[PDB]
Design a protein around this ligand. Structure first.
Ligand SMILES: Nc1ncnc2c1ncn2[C@@H]1O[C@H](CSCC[C@H](N)C(=O)O)[C@@H](O)[C@H]1O
Ligand SMILES: CCN(CC)Cc1cc(Nc2ccnc3cc(Cl)ccc23)ccc1O
Ligand SMILES: CCN(CC)Cc1cc(Nc2ccnc3cc(Cl)ccc23)ccc1O
Length: 258
């Protein structure tokens, strides 16, 4: 599937390390540890709780959830190179496992998890694939369970410019509106569906990251190339510009089963 594509483009080892430089250790998405603390601030779990992280990446989210709650965390990520990196950071901790697998082919028992959690990963999935995932997610949640998601969203396609279309095409993203996304969750039988466009906050995160990149660019070049620097600088500039003009949006979704 998109495995070899992702492993050999956006999520190369070098690419992942660059992301870590800007998001912080163990994170490859928006706001790293700080945003994660915010996203989980109203979430209640204990040591016996069971957590699924969809697209767990370098594992920072699972580590934080286990650190904060003592919960059992199980991360699934389709990139084997990323999974291997994550595994090497949690070798001592038996309540944190990662597994290399497409979440779509992954099989789980019904009523399994207290929390199903995903941060900026579901944008990789086609529209059809987003639907079957959430139906599988519904099954997997215990009756007392919560689904918790951040994901890239967008304005309708008639408002995309050429550059945004090209970015979405070459990254093989499928981006829908916050409303279209919320619609899928209700269609997949979830209750208490809560949707928020967090683009103002996302823009603040991107700004901190962008400033941080420039402030620490000497340390950056010590580890990476000037080519990788320009590319990253350029990409953040565009995400900042596009969230400002409401073209690219950051969706937050929180839902239950009953
Ligand atoms: N079909 C799929 N199944 C499982 N993981 C997938 C997937 N499609 C994309 N991914 C993964 O989703 C991750 C998105 S990047 C963000 C990773 C992590 N949630 C964090 O915030 O740091 C990537 O590591 C990618 O490999
Ligand atoms: C290298 C690791 N760093 C980047 C500077 C992580 C990181 C921190 C931030 N800072 C912040 C995140 C969330 N809330 C914040 C609130 C305030 Cl008043 C200040 C900084 C915040 C933003 C993005 C980001 O990626
Ligand atoms: C000459 C100008 N061209 C180069 C071919 C610039 C150009 C950049 C892009 N890259 C991008 C456009 C919008 N958002 C982006 C976000 C990120 Cl994280 C990275 C690249 C982006 C796409 C098409 C395009 O034509």
């Amino acid at each position: 599937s998109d495995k070899t594509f992702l492993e050999n483009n956006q999520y190369t080892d070098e690419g992942v390390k660059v992301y870590e430089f800007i998001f912080g250790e163990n994170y490859i998405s928006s706001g790293g540890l700080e945003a994660t603390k915010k996203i989980l601030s109203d979430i209640e779990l204990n040591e016996n709780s069971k957590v699924l992280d969809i697209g767990s990446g370098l594992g920072g989210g699972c580590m934080y959830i286990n650190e904060k709650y003592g919960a059992h965390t199980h991360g699934i990520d389709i990139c084997s190179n990323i999974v291997n990196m994550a595994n090497e950071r949690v070798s001592g901790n038996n309540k944190i496992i990662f597994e290399a697998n497409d979440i779509l082919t992954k099989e789980f028992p019904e009523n399994n998890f207290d929390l199903i959690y995903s941060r900026d990963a579901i944008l990789h999935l086609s529209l059809e694939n987003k639907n079957k995932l959430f139906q599988k997610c519904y099954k997997w949640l215990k009756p007392t369970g919560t689904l918790l998601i951040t994901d890239y969203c967008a304005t309708e396609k008639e408002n995309w410019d050429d550059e945004f279309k090209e970015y979405v095409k070459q990254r093989k993203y499928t981006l829908i509106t916050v409303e279209e996304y919320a619609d899928i969750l209700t269609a997949c039988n979830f209750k208490n569906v809560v949707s928020k466009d967090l683009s103002d906050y996302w823009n603040q995160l991107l700004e901190v990251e962008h400033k941080y990149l420039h402030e620490n660019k000497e340390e950056f070049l010590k580890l990476f190339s000037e080519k990788k620097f320009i590319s990253l600088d350029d990409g953040w500039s565009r995400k900042i510009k596009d969230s400002k003009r409401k073209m690219q949006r950051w969706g937050y979704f929180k839902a239950t089963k009953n």
